Amino acid sequence: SIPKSCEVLVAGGGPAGSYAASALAREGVDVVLLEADKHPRYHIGESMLPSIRPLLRFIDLEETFEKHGFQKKLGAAFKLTAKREGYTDFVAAHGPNGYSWNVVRSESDELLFKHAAKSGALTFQGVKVDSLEFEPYDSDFPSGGKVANPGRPVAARWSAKDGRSGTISFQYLVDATGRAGITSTKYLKNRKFNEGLKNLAIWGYYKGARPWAEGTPRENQPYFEGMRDGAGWCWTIPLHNGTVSVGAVLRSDLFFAKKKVTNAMIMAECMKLCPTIKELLEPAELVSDIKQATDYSYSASAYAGPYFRIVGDAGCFIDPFFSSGHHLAMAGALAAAVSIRASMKGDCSEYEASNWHARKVDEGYTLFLLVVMAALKQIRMQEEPVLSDIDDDGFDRAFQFLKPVIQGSGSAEIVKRFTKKEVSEAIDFAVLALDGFMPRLEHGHLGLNR
Amino acid sequence: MSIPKSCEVLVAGGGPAGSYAASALAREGVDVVLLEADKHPRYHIGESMLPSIRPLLRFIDLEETFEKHGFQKKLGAAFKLTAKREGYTDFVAAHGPNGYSWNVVRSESDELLFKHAAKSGALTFQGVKVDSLEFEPYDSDFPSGGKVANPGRPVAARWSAKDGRSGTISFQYLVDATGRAGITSTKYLKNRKFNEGLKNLAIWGYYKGARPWAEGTPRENQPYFEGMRDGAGWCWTIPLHNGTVSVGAVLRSDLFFADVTNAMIMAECMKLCPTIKELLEPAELVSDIKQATDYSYSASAYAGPYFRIVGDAGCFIDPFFSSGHHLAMAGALAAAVSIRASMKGDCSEYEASNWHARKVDEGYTLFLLVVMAALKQIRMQEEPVLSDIDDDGFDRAFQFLKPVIQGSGSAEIVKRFTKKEVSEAIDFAVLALGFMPRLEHGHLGLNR
Numbered sequence A: 001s002i003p004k005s006c007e008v009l010v011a012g013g014g015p016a017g018s019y020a021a022s023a024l025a026r027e028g029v030d031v032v033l034l035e036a037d038k039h040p041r042y043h044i045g046e047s048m049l050p051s052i053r054p055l056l057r058f059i060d061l062e063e064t065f066e067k068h069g070f071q072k073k074l075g076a077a078f079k080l081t082a083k084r085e086g087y088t089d090f091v092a093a094h095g096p097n098g099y100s101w102n103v104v105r106s107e108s109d110e111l112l113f114k115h116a117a118k119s120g121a122l123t124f125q126g127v128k129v130d131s132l133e134f135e136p137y138d139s140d141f142p143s144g145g146k147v148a149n150p151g152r153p154v155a156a157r158w159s160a161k162d163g164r165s166g167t168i169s170f171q172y173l174v175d176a177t178g179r180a181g182i183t184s185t186k187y188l189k190n191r192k193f194n195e196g197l198k199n200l201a202i203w204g205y206y207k208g209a210r211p212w213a214e215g216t217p218r219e220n221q222p223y224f225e226g227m228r229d230g231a232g233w234c235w236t237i238p239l240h241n242g243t244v245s246v247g248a249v250l251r252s253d254l255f256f257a258k259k260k261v262t263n264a265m266i267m268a269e270c271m272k273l274c275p276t277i278k279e280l281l282e283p284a285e286l287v288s289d290i291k292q293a294t295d296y297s298y299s300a301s302a303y304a305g306p307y308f309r310i311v312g313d314a315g316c317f318i319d320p321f322f323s324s325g326h327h328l329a330m331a332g333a334l335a336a337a338v339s340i341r342a343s344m345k346g347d348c349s350e351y352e353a354s355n356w357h358a359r360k361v362d363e364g365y366t367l368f369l370l371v372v373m374a375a376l377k378q379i380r381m382q383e384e385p386v387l388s389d390i391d392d393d394g395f396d397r398a399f400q401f402l403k404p405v406i407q408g409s410g411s412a413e414i415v416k417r418f419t420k421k422e423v424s425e426a427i428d429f430a431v432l433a434l435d436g437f438m439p440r441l442e443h444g445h446l447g448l449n450r
Numbered sequence B: 001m002s003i004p005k006s007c008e009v010l011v012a013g014g015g016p017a018g019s020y021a022a023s024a025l026a027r028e029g030v031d032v033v034l035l036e037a038d039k040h041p042r043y044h045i046g047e048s049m050l051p052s053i054r055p056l057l058r059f060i061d062l063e064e065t066f067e068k069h070g071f072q073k074k075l076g077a078a079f080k081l082t083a084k085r086e087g088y089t090d091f092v093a094a095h096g097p098n099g100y101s102w103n104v105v106r107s108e109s110d111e112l113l114f115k116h117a118a119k120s121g122a123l124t125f126q127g128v129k130v131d132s133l134e135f136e137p138y139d140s141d142f143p144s145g146g147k148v149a150n151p152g153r154p155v156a157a158r159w160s161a162k163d164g165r166s167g168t169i170s171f172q173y174l175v176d177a178t179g180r181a182g183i184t185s186t187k188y189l190k191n192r193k194f195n196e197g198l199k200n201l202a203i204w205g206y207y208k209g210a211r212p213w214a215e216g217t218p219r220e221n222q223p224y225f226e227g228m229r230d231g232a233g234w235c236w237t238i239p240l241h242n243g244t245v246s247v248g249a250v251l252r253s254d255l256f257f258a259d260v261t262n263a264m265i266m267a268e269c270m271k272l273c274p275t276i277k278e279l280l281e282p283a284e285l286v287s288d289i290k291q292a293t294d295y296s297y298s299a300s301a302y303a304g305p306y307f308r309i310v311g312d313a314g315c316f317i318d319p320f321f322s323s324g325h326h327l328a329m330a331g332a333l334a335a336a337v338s339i340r341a342s343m344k345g346d347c348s349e350y351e352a353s354n355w356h357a358r359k360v361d362e363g364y365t366l367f368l369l370v371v372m373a374a375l376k377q378i379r380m381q382e383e384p385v386l387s388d389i390d391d392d393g394f395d396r397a398f399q400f401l402k403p404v405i406q407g408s409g410s411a412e413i414v415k416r417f418t419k420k421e422v423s424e425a426i427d428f429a430v431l432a433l434g435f436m437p438r439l440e441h442g443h444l445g446l447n448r
């Protein structure tokens, strides 16, 4: 049965949970991982970044993902306005071995979850964390502006649908709960929504649509374009299941402003405002149900505290235009494992480690924030030279600067590919468009240097 | 009813390549006569298929009949070349959940194909043996060379029946689907050239009560192939809807000898395949253990003046990657395309015969170098032949070999894999070592 005591409790067996559980268990930590669903289970989020490989490599899962046979993504196209699309190429930057994947999430989350068990973490499914018990930490615990002291969490109550129930004690907590955000939403209450990105989304899977850039060395790559009226944007993501993932994103007010099988109809109506998406789906056959979900973007006032870490959607969320969700989940899961291991064996104080994790979550989120915002500003405009596109017929100059951030660099040190000089130019270029400790990433010696 | 004296196309041999070519031609309205020396249903080896079977069967509208029969669906195949982790090819990953293939009791599918030829409008006769072919001199503008030959034009065939009846039938085109007998290639062109490295022999039997491989996994009970640990050969397990698993071993003719031997060597090769033995741990033999010749061969030419050679009648490669049934029907399609193109004036006969012969050669060459690379890795048990920089197993190699192993790279009906991907499959194996079809029903032929 589930043990009463462990070293680290990881709440939620999603990508950020399984990654943090595996990375800690591969260091020998007595990790317990609790997941309310039994894998495989459906979840949306199939487009990945090339940063997935260095992250998966640290936990020795990269080749297992390669051997599964997901649809490879060599890049992504972004037709923000009526001008010709901008395109980021993964295999050009990282070589012919540097492609990423478009992923059926029911299977990758299983691969990560089973890898956590094979890594030596105690994994349990159908077990839901009902509550967290924060003991008072009445001692000084300073912040740099991104950690909070609701006390120290030391026990969690859990239930299983087969009727068993109990409580588990732990020394550290990893919050990978997801949108539910148990710590951020239900013990803390520090979710800060961005009113400009309070979006809604609808999607479905289609068979027989014909690929983009047929014959071209960029055939059937993921394709994103903004609506010609500027109200939102749509995506196409082809998958190995034989279907292409298709969906549309609109702000909550602008979504019902077009309410003037309703979900299937607005899917077709919003599709009209994307002429190239409209062209690709001409012969398409619908095989999926068309599903709607909330898609609000939010940050948090704190991402860590006394002996607990918040990772992935449990802390922050940004509009999935640049496929940042799965990247930021595992990138924060690595920072949680690094900061916990540093705290465990005395590389630094807990407040030094907890603050370090919270920054790596905050600055990583900030990078995609200003980049996605610049694209969404260009999508909300159409004729105005956002990204400085006045004299050109495309965005290729803009995506030459946005290269490192769009491909997942700029905060996690494990993404060695791009220099911090190039990243700085990615930040400077994007803000003008809108206008210490060091990880020891060695297996068996994970922690922080000064 | 009896065999007619004249027809448009005579198809010799009612195997898969014969029945497919008969159906594809008869569905175009051609007066096709199909002669088969064996009476269906009859036993024949070859039970593992490729996912390319569906686009081929769909062109002749036979997919749904095969689906309704209930063959064991095949989602992929495993290949444990050496003691390292298995390599695996995934059909459902590439072709979707409806793109699986089958493991097939061949006595029943060959009958379905043969009867489908009759429903397609071909005149089908069983127990009728083509004894000889009458090649008239074709001294016209038709040179030899390029995988085409000019032994003259075949225009009549002598035939015999098991009741004693005999006669002769005239035809404008010939389709040689006779098989290993290879009437045209072995006794009229005399152009079968064996590869001395692949002069293999095989033994097999069917076992009941064996337990599935990879139980519980989404890849449970898929066909499993592994090379013998001493490097002498390889074994297979192919589970069938019959509740039994087809089990067999393949050895080179010299290494084979290194009656009762068949039952004993069956156990010895199984012992040299630890995972095959594990699946057959409680198994009981219900079949006879049978031996047959399994030599690999090519031909200097696969077509000529108004005749087409398809399947084993032309070429054969070691069945490690289950290429035999694919290449049979893939060549049968090319024979129907090239004959119809010649019939309706899309191009000259000399242009069509070269196109068919190239598609037989080009398809065979793909599987040749791929099987050769895998069999070299099996004899180099300890040497990395197909092992690249990796963490374990051969699965990275099978990600490169993916399109050829699943039947792409020559047949135009298998669109699934890009022509970019096929190029890397060719280079990967070698480094270890015009006309366009009109695949329209009722408009079959060639464009330029």
Ligand SMILES: Cc1cc2nc3c(=O)[nH]c(=O)nc-3n(C[C@H](O)[C@H](O)[C@H](O)COP(=O)(O)OP(=O)(O)OC[C@H]3O[C@@H](n4cnc5c(N)ncnc54)[C@H](O)[C@@H]3O)c2cc1C
Residues within 6 Å of the ligand: A011, A012, A013, A014, A015, A016, A017, A034, A035, A036, A037, A043, A044, A045, A046, A047, A048, A127, A128, A129, A130, A176, A177, A178, A179, A180, A182, A201, A203, A247, A293, A294, A295, A311, A312, A313, A314, A320, A323, A324, A325, A326, A327, A329
């Ligand atoms: C429409 C849409 C499109 C998207 N497209 C993309 C894309 O293209 N690319 C991309 O990278 N991202 C995309 N995302 C985002 C992506 O879905 C997430 O960012 C990603 O799943 C990372 O979050 P996570 O790791 O927490 O996963 P989650 O699925 O949020 O993991 C949380 C897990 O914890 C479990 N859990 C919840 N409560 C408890 C509890 N009390 N106890 C135990 N377990 C619990 C849940 O069942 C779940 O399995 C998209 C999101 C949306 C809405």
Ligand SMILES: Cc1cc2nc3c(=O)[nH]c(=O)nc-3n(C[C@H](O)[C@H](O)[C@H](O)COP(=O)(O)OP(=O)(O)OC[C@H]3O[C@@H](n4cnc5c(N)ncnc54)[C@H](O)[C@@H]3O)c2cc1C
Residues within 6 Å of the ligand: B012, B013, B014, B015, B016, B017, B018, B035, B036, B037, B038, B044, B045, B046, B047, B048, B049, B128, B129, B130, B131, B177, B178, B179, B180, B181, B183, B202, B292, B293, B294, B310, B311, B312, B313, B319, B322, B323, B324, B325, B326, B328
């Ligand atoms: C041990 C072994 C294992 C194999 N495993 C596989 C496998 O897993 N998968 C796979 O795809 N392939 C496999 N094969 C290959 C497969 O058996 C053949 O490649 C495939 O069946 C193609 O045969 P065919 O239709 O061309 O010839 P056949 O199937 O032999 O058909 C020719 C027919 O014509 C008849 N005939 C012969 N002479 C005459 C004549 N003169 N007149 C009239 N009719 C005549 C024959 O009786 C026969 O019925 C294997 C082969 C061997 C030896």
Ligand SMILES: [Cl-]
Residues within 6 Å of the ligand: A047, A048, A075, A076, A322, A323
């Ligand atoms: Cl992207």
